[PDB]
Every structure is written in structure tokens, then in C-alpha cells.
Amino acid sequence: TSVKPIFSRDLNEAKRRVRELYRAWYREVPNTVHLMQLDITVKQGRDKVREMFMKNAHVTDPRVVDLLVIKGKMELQETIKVWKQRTHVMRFFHETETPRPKDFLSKFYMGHDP
Amino acid sequence: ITHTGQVYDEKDYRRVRFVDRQKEVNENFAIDLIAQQPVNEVEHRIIACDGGGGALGHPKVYINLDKETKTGTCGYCGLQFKQ
Amino acid sequence: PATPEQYVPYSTTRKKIHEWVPPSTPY
Amino acid sequence: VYDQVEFDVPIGSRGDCYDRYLCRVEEMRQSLRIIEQCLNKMPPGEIKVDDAKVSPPKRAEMKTSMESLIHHFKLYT
Amino acid sequence: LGLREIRVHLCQRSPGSQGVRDFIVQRYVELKKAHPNLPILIRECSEVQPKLWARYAFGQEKTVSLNNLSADEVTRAMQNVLS
Amino acid sequence: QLITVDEKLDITTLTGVPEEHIKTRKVRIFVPARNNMQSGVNNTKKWKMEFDTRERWENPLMGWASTADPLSNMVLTFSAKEDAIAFAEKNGWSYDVEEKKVPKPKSKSYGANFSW
Amino acid sequence: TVRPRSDVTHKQLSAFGEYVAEILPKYVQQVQVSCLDELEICIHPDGVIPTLTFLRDHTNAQFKSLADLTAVDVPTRQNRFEIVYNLLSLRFNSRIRVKTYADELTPIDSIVSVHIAANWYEREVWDMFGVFFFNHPDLRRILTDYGFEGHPFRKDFPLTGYVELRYDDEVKRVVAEPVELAQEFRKFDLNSPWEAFP
Amino acid sequence: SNLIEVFVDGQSVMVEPGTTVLQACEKVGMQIPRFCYHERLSVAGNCRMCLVEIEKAPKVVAACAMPVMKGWNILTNSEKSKKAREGVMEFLLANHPLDCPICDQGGECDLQDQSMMFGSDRSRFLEGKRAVEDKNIGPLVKTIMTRCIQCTRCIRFASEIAGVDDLGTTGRGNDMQVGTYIEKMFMSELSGNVIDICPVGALTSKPYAFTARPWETRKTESIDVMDAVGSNIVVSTRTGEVMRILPRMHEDINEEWISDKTRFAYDGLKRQRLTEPMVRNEKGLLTYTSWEDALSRVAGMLQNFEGNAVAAIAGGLVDAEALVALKDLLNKVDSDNLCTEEIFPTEGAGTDLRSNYLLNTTIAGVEEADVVLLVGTNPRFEAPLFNARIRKSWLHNDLKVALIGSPVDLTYRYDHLGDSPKILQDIASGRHSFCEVLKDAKKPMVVLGSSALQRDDGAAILVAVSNMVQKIRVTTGVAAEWKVMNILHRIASQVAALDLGYKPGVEAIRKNPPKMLFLLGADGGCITRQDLPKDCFIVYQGHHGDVGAPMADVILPGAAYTEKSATYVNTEGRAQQTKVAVTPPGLAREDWKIIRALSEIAGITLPYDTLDQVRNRLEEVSPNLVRYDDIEETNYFQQASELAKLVNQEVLADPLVPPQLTIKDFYMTDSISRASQTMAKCVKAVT
Numbered sequence A: 001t002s003v004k005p006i007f008s009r010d011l012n013e014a015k016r017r018v019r020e021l022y023r024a025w026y027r028e029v030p031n032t033v034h035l036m037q038l039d040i041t042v043k044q045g046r047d048k049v050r051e052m053f054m055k056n057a058h059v060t061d062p063r064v065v066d067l068l069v070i071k072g073k074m075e076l077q078e079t080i081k082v083w084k085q086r087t088h089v090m091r092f093f094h095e096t097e098t099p100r101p102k103d104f105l106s107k108f109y110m111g112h113d114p
Numbered sequence B: 001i002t003h004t005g006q007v008y009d010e011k012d013y014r015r016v017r018f019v020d021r022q023k024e025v026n027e028n029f030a031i032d033l034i035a036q037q038p039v040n041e042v043e044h045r046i047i048a049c050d051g052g053g054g055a056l057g058h059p060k061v062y063i064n065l066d067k068e069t070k071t072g073t074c075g076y077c078g079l080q081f082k083q
Numbered sequence C: 001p002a003t004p005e006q007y008v009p010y011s012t013t014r015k016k017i018h019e020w021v022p023p024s025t026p027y
Numbered sequence D: 001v002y003d004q005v006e007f008d009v010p011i012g013s014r015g016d017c018y019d020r021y022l023c024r025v026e027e028m029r030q031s032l033r034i035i036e037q038c039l040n041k042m043p044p045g046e047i048k049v050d051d052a053k054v055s056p057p058k059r060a061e062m063k064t065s066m067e068s069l070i071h072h073f074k075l076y077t
Numbered sequence E: 001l002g003l004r005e006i007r008v009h010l011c012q013r014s015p016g017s018q019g020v021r022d023f024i025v026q027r028y029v030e031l032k033k034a035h036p037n038l039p040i041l042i043r044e045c046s047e048v049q050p051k052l053w054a055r056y057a058f059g060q061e062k063t064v065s066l067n068n069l070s071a072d073e074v075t076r077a078m079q080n081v082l083s
Numbered sequence F: 001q002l003i004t005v006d007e008k009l010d011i012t013t014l015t016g017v018p019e020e021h022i023k024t025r026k027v028r029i030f031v032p033a034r035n036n037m038q039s040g041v042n043n044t045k046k047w048k049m050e051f052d053t054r055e056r057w058e059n060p061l062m063g064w065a066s067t068a069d070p071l072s073n074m075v076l077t078f079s080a081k082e083d084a085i086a087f088a089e090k091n092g093w094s095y096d097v098e099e100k101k102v103p104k105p106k107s108k109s110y111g112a113n114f115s116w
Numbered sequence G: 001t002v003r004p005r006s007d008v009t010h011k012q013l014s015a016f017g018e019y020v021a022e023i024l025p026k027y028v029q030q031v032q033v034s035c036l037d038e039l040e041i042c043i044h045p046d047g048v049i050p051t052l053t054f055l056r057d058h059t060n061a062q063f064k065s066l067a068d069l070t071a072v073d074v075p076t077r078q079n080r081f082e083i084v085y086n087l088l089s090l091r092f093n094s095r096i097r098v099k100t101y102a103d104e105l106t107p108i109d110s111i112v113s114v115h116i117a118a119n120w121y122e123r124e125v126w127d128m129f130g131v132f133f134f135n136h137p138d139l140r141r142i143l144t145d146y147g148f149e150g151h152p153f154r155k156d157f158p159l160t161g162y163v164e165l166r167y168d169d170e171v172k173r174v175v176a177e178p179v180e181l182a183q184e185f186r187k188f189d190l191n192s193p194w195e196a197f198p
Numbered sequence H: 001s002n003l004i005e006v007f008v009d010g011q012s013v014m015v016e017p018g019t020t021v022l023q024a025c026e027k028v029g030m031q032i033p034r035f036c037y038h039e040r041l042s043v044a045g046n047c048r049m050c051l052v053e054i055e056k057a058p059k060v061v062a063a064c065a066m067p068v069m070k071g072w073n074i075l076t077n078s079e080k081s082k083k084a085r086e087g088v089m090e091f092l093l094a095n096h097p098l099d100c101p102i103c104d105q106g107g108e109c110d111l112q113d114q115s116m117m118f119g120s121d122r123s124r125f126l127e128g129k130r131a132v133e134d135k136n137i138g139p140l141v142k143t144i145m146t147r148c149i150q151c152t153r154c155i156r157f158a159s160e161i162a163g164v165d166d167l168g169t170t171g172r173g174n175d176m177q178v179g180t181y182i183e184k185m186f187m188s189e190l191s192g193n194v195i196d197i198c199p200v201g202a203l204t205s206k207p208y209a210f211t212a213r214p215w216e217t218r219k220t221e222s223i224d225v226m227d228a229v230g231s232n233i234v235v236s237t238r239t240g241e242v243m244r245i246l247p248r249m250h251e252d253i254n255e256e257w258i259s260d261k262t263r264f265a266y267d268g269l270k271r272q273r274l275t276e277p278m279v280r281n282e283k284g285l286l287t288y289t290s291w292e293d294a295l296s297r298v299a300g301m302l303q304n305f306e307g308n309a310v311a312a313i314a315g316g317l318v319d320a321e322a323l324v325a326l327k328d329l330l331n332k333v334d335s336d337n338l339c340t341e342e343i344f345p346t347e348g349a350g351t352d353l354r355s356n357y358l359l360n361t362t363i364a365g366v367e368e369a370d371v372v373l374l375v376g377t378n379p380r381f382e383a384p385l386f387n388a389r390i391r392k393s394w395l396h397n398d399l400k401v402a403l404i405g406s407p408v409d410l411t412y413r414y415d416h417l418g419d420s421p422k423i424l425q426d427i428a429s430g431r432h433s434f435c436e437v438l439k440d441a442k443k444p445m446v447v448l449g450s451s452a453l454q455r456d457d458g459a460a461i462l463v464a465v466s467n468m469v470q471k472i473r474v475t476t477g478v479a480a481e482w483k484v485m486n487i488l489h490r491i492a493s494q495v496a497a498l499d500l501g502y503k504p505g506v507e508a509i510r511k512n513p514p515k516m517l518f519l520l521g522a523d524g525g526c527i528t529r530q531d532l533p534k535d536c537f538i539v540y541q542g543h544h545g546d547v548g549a550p551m552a553d554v555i556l557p558g559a560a561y562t563e564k565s566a567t568y569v570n571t572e573g574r575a576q577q578t579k580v581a582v583t584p585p586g587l588a589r590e591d592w593k594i595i596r597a598l599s600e601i602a603g604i605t606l607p608y609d610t611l612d613q614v615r616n617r618l619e620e621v622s623p624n625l626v627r628y629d630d631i632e633e634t635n636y637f638q639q640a641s642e643l644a645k646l647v648n649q650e651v652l653a654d655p656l657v658p659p660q661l662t663i664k665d666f667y668m669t670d671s672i673s674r675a676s677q678t679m680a681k682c683v684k685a686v687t
């Protein structure tokens, strides 16, 4: 049914924005690692970026992709600037968190929660 | 052991806590202090029990000491009243 | 009108569960 | 009851920190004028509306009358 | 390999189930007699075309949709399974 | 303007809910039932959407009940089945709608107990 | 125990409510003076800049200051968020409420042009509820953490969030961690089941 | 259209003639403050807290007893009907003892609220209060009756729902005390409901005396598994342990009432409970060990043993989801020796057409029946909330009840046709007197309790009953959707088992002994190590260590219905869903997963890996398990009879006797009950 567009009209039109963000992030990862004295490698980080831009790679409601960009850009602003410290950026890497197993037998074997 | 049990089993690892320390346990058990009290004899069938006070004690409830078979016990003070 | 007496908490609760104790002698 | 106490708002010109400081010092002085009236004219009465549905019943009442115990229990819980 | 049971899931009131229902009223009483103790669990469908499942030797099962399949057809379909 | 789209408006990616709390979690739209202990029917009129019950365990030090289910104390309150199914679908949770159970009309008469 | 009130106000303001509804028929959906003697003009989201400009700059209704901009979230309503703008007229010593409705994915305009007070409040509404304000200079998180994911004041967000922080020696940084609370928050179902006679 | 029109403060609703003024307010939506009026209890008018003012009328009328007339406008929030409540509440409170912080119906008080909403801000009673003498009505009800507002709900329930007229009012004036004149305990099932029905906290529950306070209790809506009526219930859990189970209303199954067993056996749920997976070790002692080790003990034996050497004796409270996970596993090693402890005669269509084994007439049909011939059961102690059904329909309607069993206390006036299974043949012949009584019945029903079927001639008893239902149906010419034959169960996991395709009775395991048996919550003595192959490898899958645990090579602890989102189904096939009120204790896990996991260690992995998937599996085996709260009607009876006619069996002269002869028989009947300290206290009180 009809819906007002947030910023883009067709999913294709919007994707134009999604790519104009990917590029931005990609061209920024290198800078961050150095500026925030992060320890992860440029390649490693750039991987994360794709992962995320990829995680959201299934929605088709332009309005949603028009919205995730914005949220997305905002996250650059902060990261481009150093408004975010090392702690903030490094949180995208679950360094301490032990990744949860997924195998049923691997979960049944630990924790009553599914 | 507290008036409500709680005593840790010898094997319980929850005992390290008290090592180089000790256990806060009140020696004055109210199960016994209230038993060390004279049953309040009364003349009337029913009696009050403001908790030995007006506004400084417990809500005021009237107890039916009607059967010598049982000394009414105000649910608040645990005071037995002997008809 | 270093001290050893340090408050230490409990779980003053009477343990709220009871496990089957397995049969003492085999069958 | 501010409608019953008399005070002068300290407005200022040249909106600059100083004028704002001077205004804050005046309001302290004007508040002493309002505190002066409140001590001089405070009425005898009770301090809380006493429909027990809104403000909790008095300590003696809740310990002697059932309607007050119910109103204290419900209001606090 | 070896039929172990046959569960006939038939909607209760629909054109599709129609006839399947007939099979039961016309041959179940006999099928059960003919090849008894063949678990034949007739159960109910829910706006899902009638189907006939059938376990075999080792956890194996086969489906045959019989939506709008007529009576005689069902009859044979059952006979085909218990070949 | 007025672009047209055909989604169930899944804002699952705008919500910000960790995947595992948007994937393995079942909301249960239902109109709360009455507290048999009381006869007030004012707490059985609005549809609630509560989530699944996960581990409630014991804090080793003090014996308190601890939990790791962030969405445990969550009881969203709607006003109709339609508006609850919509929110759950909107957020990407799985639902288990339960139809309302209003008492049917039972005829009561004073004199009846005087017949013989 | 019954408020000392003036009926003059109810009437005077009611009359202004009809005035505003007559002057702006295209955007105002419902105007009502509540019994608290306050006024509420409910406008279609498109009327956010027209309705507020008329009130900021009209001789018979000057509403110069924006007291606050907030968004109640009623999850049931289709358009959940109900942005509410409270405005004050120093000239006429009266206050007005203009409230409009916005959904998760439909942004409403920004009044920063009409009142520069809103530059910050609109950022807080985005951070707290996720409503987006069109052509708003510098919209970005005012209150939440730099990396916070999720809009907190939404009724569908867990009180205590999903992440907490701690210092991990092994990594020498303040690391996040899925929330484990040592005492869940007892949720009390305190709400009587006997309704009050209206 | 006999609607008559009456105004509720103007809404002008239209109502059937004979609806009370209180009822008229309800449909508009207004609530008259009420005490002593309960929907399923007779109107008494004792409190008169419901006085309202119909319009242009001289005095206030009692909304509970006044039939609304034509065009009377009720004014429920008038200046008068509030002085008629502000002044009654003055009285109820005047003689009331202020021990609200003792009264555990603290937040569950219909008398503080109504005081706190419709009553008065203050008190004018400056005089002396009264006090009554606490008596002992049993070990389940704590009657601190100085609390009583003489609302006579208790007296009525005790006399109209439970037929036990032991309670009564004694004395007149302000010392009318509603307690048993002589101290005789109120011993009956349905007893605990008095707690829930007394709005005052005068008599409340003694086990749940002071463990909690209602605002804290988190309330999860689930299903009764203790009995096969499948009564709806709400499990009130605080900080993760169940504190009380109280009824929640289901019009058809339990309409606001639950049994004494399924309300005080929540305590049994918390002890003797299995938690860690022990494995026989050393000299034979069971030794706690990790799942991985305990599961491969079982998996290794399973791979070694072929079909018909592996068997499962399930039974009791196991859910449908575990029952399909245990069948799917043992078929993946080709043994279909899966069985249940309660023997349902399969010498017929057997488990195959649900019409066979399901109360066909629903519980709610007992209200429309005309004559019920209960044969073989003491409905009272087997399915109490169905005994109540026949209680209400014998009182408010006119059911003629007839029992072919032991003459037993049935809380109603039954006709004892006799204690002999063969007299069933007598009615089929038309020889016995009640043969005409039924002939006179336009809607008759026959009930055969599984407790009979469990005897050796149970196959013959079912066949004999089916013959009589056949000609009862022919002679009455009863309509097809009216269904005379139904059979009620007393085990929660029977109907579902039978539906999923589990074959009833351990008769098959008896003839060929399995090398390995996976008892699934079975605490029955149906087979014993003594009756098994020398190897006798057997692994208990359950929650409480009772009979199957100490004779078990492996212990795989499971959960209970308070601790899993499983499905159950009562006797007329209404599938229902238990919700997880508390996470399962210790290393204990959900029953379906233990078996999915054992299958993964075994290597014959089951297809589903999440519970929605197991629900999808259930849809394949039996499709009316995926469907909740729905009873389906396809009476495939006629063909059932044809096979019954083929079956020839002898009904032995031994009288058919229900195992639960008197109420001590009833209290302790299952693991979760036999472990109950409250049930144990109840048992000794009777003895």
C-alpha cells in the first residue's frame, strides 16, 4: 500500500545511498585503526563493515533502508570524529564475550534456555 | 545456626566466606524470648492488644480469650493471654 | 544520657528444594 | 499561595553575565522578603489533604480504625 | 520395507475430504478386519487437503495427497500401501 | 511521493534488539485472566503481549533471584487482538494468540432456590 | 480537596481553540480544552510547521517559547509516537499544547526553523524514541552512549537494556557484556481489579 | 424477541426478561460493588453492598436479586447509591479485625478495594470490636474466622458445588459465626475452592499461609496435569519457585474451580525431585555424572540393541512432545513396542478412531444430557471437576444418574443398578428396569471409566457397553451429533499417547522382554527388573525419584508441567498448552530435548530441533494436537460397533470396583503427589 518516502522512493534509488555509505566507511576504517590506536588490522575491520552492511542485506522496504543509512551515517560522524573512544569502537568485536554455541547438542549441554 | 537454620553444610563451598572472618548471627531468638513471658491473665471474654502502646505499638486487634483451652495469641506480638 | 569481625552475607532461606538421594545399596 | 505573598521580580538590562549575577543576588534578597511573610503568616491547620484515598492515614488512626489500615495498606502497596 | 502403520488424516467437512470420509464408512470396518492390528490411526485434518501417511521399517514415511480424490481411488490407495 | 511497498513493516533492524532476543523468543498475546482470589473484572479487559519465561536462578552470595533475560519484565498492553499481532509482526517476534474467554451469560434468580 | 479553579479560563481558551481551528482548518484534527483548564490542538503531522508558525507569529496568539517537545509512545495505536509540543505566550499569559502522531518509519518535520529551542529536544526524541525529524540541522544522539543500539524510552525496550559494562583486565578496556542482573527486578502486579466509578 | 429494554445510566441496553439489576449493569460494562454474590452460586442478598437506585423509585434495590423490569433506568453512580455503599462499608469494617498485614488476602481482598474505591475515608466506630474463636476445618483451610463478613458464599458452595453440607450458620445477631457446629473437618475434594471464594481472608490456605503476598507473584497461565479433566490453572511464581496454583476460568473444562490435589501438590513438586543425570556406578550405586557421559551410556546400549529389544513404558504426566520424540527415536531402531501403563482395550478399533477413546460428549455436554449411566468409576475421586459437572446438572437441570460400580459416595442421588459387569448385558437385553428410563431419555450418555478397562475383562466390558450404546441409540432414536458413548481417563498422558499412536497396555512388553527399556516418567509397577531379561538395562526419564529411579541403570532427569511449554490433552481431546512458569531445576532438561539429544549421540537424529518444529511433527502424527482449545466432532462410532460385534469376550462376575473407593485413596496418586508433604499431612488426617 501507499507510504510516504523517508528520503528515497525506490529500493534501487536508495541503494545508491547504501553504497555511498559503504564507500565512506571503507575509506574510514584505515583512519580509525590508526587514530584510535586500535589494534585490529585494516583488513580485519573492513571485514566487519561489510558484515554489517551485509547483515541488513535483506530488507526491501526502502523506508527502512532510508533509515538505516541515516543511523549508519551518524555512526560514521562519531567515528570519523573521535567522539567515540577506543572502547566504543572496539565493542563491535565481542572481544571478551564468548560466542554462544548453536548446535542443539551444544546448547542442550549447557543452559536450560533454548 | 540462625534462628532460621541457614547453617552451611561442612562441604558447602559457601563457607569460604567466613574464613579470616566470622558469621553475623543474633543470639536472641524471639522463639524463646516470647516464651519467657507471663501469659497475660484477663477477666473479659475479649481483650485488646495495642502492642503495649498507642501508635508506638502494633495495630490494635481484639483477641478472644474465650476458651481456656487456648490462650489467644495476638498475631502481632505472639503474646498468649490466659482468659 | 584486617579485623575478622566482618559482616558476611547468607541466603537465609532453608534451601527451597530437595534432590532424590539415590538408593544406598545396589539391586 | 504565592498569590498571597508580595515580592519584586529582579529584571535586568544589558543581558550580560553581570546583570544576570546581579539578578540572582536580588532574588536571594527578594526570597528573604517572601520567607519573612511566610513565617509572619503561616496558618494553623494540618499539613496534608486528609481524604485518605490520596494522602496516607495518620500513624495513630491506621493502628486503631480499620478504614485507615485498609487505606494505608492500599496506598503504600 | 514393512508397513508398520497408516495414518489417514482427513478433513471433517470439505469437498476435498469428501469421499475420503466415504472410504471410512464403506471399507475401514473391513480393512481393519482384513489386515488387523495394522495400526490405522484415522485422525483429523485442519483445512489441509486429506493425506495418507505410512511409516515403514526404519523411520521411513511416504505421503500421498488425495484432495478431491474420489472414494474408489482412496480404497486402492490404502490397498497400494498395504500391498 | 506516496511510494508503494509490500512488507509487514519489519522494523526488526530499526528496533535494536539483539538477534537472539528477536529470534528465539515467543510473545503470547492474551487477555489476562481474573485473580480467582478477587471478583474484580477490571484486570481482564486489555490484551497483553508477554514474552517467554527463561532462567530465573540464585545469586550465590545472597540467595536473590538473578536472570539474563533482558526481555523478562516486559508486558506490553494493547487494546485489541489486531493491534497486538501487528506490533509483534512489526518487531519480528513469534506470537501465540489466545482468544478471549468472557464468562457466558448464566441466568440467576432469587426465587429458584425456594422451589421444592 | 477540590481544586480552586476559574471558569473564565476554560471559556476563554475554549474560544481560542475554535479560533485556531477556524484559522487553520486544513491541519487541525481535534481541539479540546481539558478540564485541567489547558488547551490541546491536535494537528495532522504535515501541519507541524504551519500550526506552530501561526502560533509563534500571530498578533492574537503569540506563543514565543517552546516549553518542551516529547513523544508519548502508545504501542497499540498504529502511529505509536505522539509528539507533543507545549508552547507559552508571554504576551497573553497562557499556554497551549499542539500534539501530532508519528509512526516508527514516517518522519515528521522539524520546527528548529520555528523555534531554535527544538534543536536539542528533537535530537532527544530521536535518541529516546526513534522519531526522525526532516531537515533538522545535526540530528544525533543527545543522551544515550556513543555506541548505544536501540531507542530506550520506547515501551518495547527492556528497562535495563541488553548491555552493561565492566573493566576486563585481559583486554584492559571497558567491555560490554550481555546483561546479567543479580536480582531481577521484581515486577509488582499492583493494580486493582475494582474500577473506580467515573 | 422477548428482550426487554432497561436503562443503564442511559445506555438503554436490552436484556432477557429475568436478568438481575447487577447483570444489566454488567452488559453496559458497569460493576456493582458486590459481596455474597458469585456468578455460579445462588443469590443470597446477605451483604446488601450492591444497593442501587432504579429511577424515580422510592428505595434502593438489591442488584443481586431484583429482576430488572421494563424501562427502569439504573443509576449506579448517583448521590444515593453512594451513600448506600459509604454506609454499608461503614458496617462491614466496624466489626472487622484490623490485621490486614496478617491477612494474606492482603492485595487479594475484595473488601479493602471496595472500601478503597466506593467506601469511606474515615471511621466513626469508636466502640468495641467482636472476636470469634478460631476452629480447625482441616489441614488445608486456615479459618481465622474473626475475619468473616457473614456473606454465606462458603455455606452455599459447600452445599451447591461440593455436595458436602457440613458448613452452616449458627446463632443470630452479631455472633452468627459460619463454622461447623461440631468440629468435623471439611473433608472433600473441591475443598480448597472455599479459599478462593471467600473474598475476606477469614479462611485461607494453610500451606500457602505466609510465604508471599500477591503483588509480587508473577502469574503464568498453564494446564492441570494431575487429573485428565485438564482443568485450566494459573501458577503463581515468585523469584523462580511456584508459590501457589489457583484456578483460572475455562467455561467448558473447570469453570473457576480446581481439585484439592492440583492445588496443594505444588509442594510435592519441590522435593524428591531429580536434577542431575546419575549413572549406575561401582557396585551399582547411582553416581551423579555429566549429561555427555549419561547420554552415551544410553546411546551405546541403544546402538547395540535392535528392534523389539528396546521398549518404552511411558505413563503418568509425560507431555505429547516427549511422547512423539520417544516414538520417533525407537522407530529409528525399528521397535514400535512404545506403550502406556494404563491398558485401554485395543481388541477392537482400539486406539484407531478417537470416537473410541474420548469422552465424546464434552464435559460441557453433561449439562444437556438427560440420563447418565456411569459404569465403572467413582467420578468424584477420579475426575472431580467432571463429578461437579454431573453435580450442577443434577441440581439446576434434571440429570438421572445411574451407577454400575460399587455403591459409592457420589455427592448426588444416583441409582445403584448393581456391582456386576454382566448386568450391562441385562440392560442391553432390555431386562433391567433402567432400560425403559433410557428409552424415555431423548439425550442419554454412558460413561465408562478407564479404571474399569484396567481389569482383565476390560476388552469385554468395552464391547458390552458398545452393544448397549448401540440399541440405546436405536431405541431413543437420538440425533447423530448427540453422542451416547464416551469414556473418561484418570491419567493426563493417555489420550495424547493413544492419539500419537502409542499402543496402550504393557501386554506386548510382557510377552517378549526388551533388552533395554527407556521408562519415560513411569513410576508404575507394570514391569519390574524382576520381570525383565537378565541384562535388564533400563533408563528412567522423569522428574521425581519414586519407583523407576532406584531400579534404573541410567537417570536422565526431566521437568514437570510447571517447567516446560509442553502440550497435554484431556478426555474429550481438547489439546492444551502448559507454559513455563519456572525454569527446570539443576541440570534437569525439557523431556523432548533429552530424547532429541540422545538421538544425536545415537546418530539417528530426530528432524525437529526447536519446539515449534516438534509441534509441526505432532501435526503429522495426529493433527488435533497442533490445534489448541478445540474439540473435534467426527463420531466414527458406527464402524467402531461393527468391530466390537466381531470381538467375543467374557465379562467375569467379579464386581467392577474403582480403585479410589474413599478420599484417602484420592489424595496421593502420582509422583508429584506422592511426594507432597501437604498430601501426606492430608492422608494422615483421614487416617
Ligand code: SF4
Binding pocket: D070, H096, H097, H098, H099, H100, H101, H103, H104, H105, H106, H109, H110, H111, H112, H147, H199, H200, H201, H202
Ligand atoms: S480481609 Fe484481610 S485484608 Fe481484607 S481487610 Fe479484612 S483483614 Fe485487611
Ligand code: SF4
Binding pocket: H147, H148, H149, H150, H151, H152, H153, H154, H155, H178, H197, H198, H199, H200, H202, H203
Ligand atoms: S467464610 Fe468467607 S465466605 Fe464463608 S462467610 Fe465468612 S466470608 Fe463469606
Ligand code: FES
Binding pocket: H033, H034, H035, H036, H037, H044, H045, H046, H047, H048, H049, H050, H051, H062, H063, H064, H065
Ligand atoms: S451483592 Fe447484592 S446482595 Fe450482597
Ligand SMILES: [Zn+2]
Binding pocket: B049, B050, B051, B052, B058, B074, B075, B076, B077, B078, B079
Ligand atoms: Zn499484640
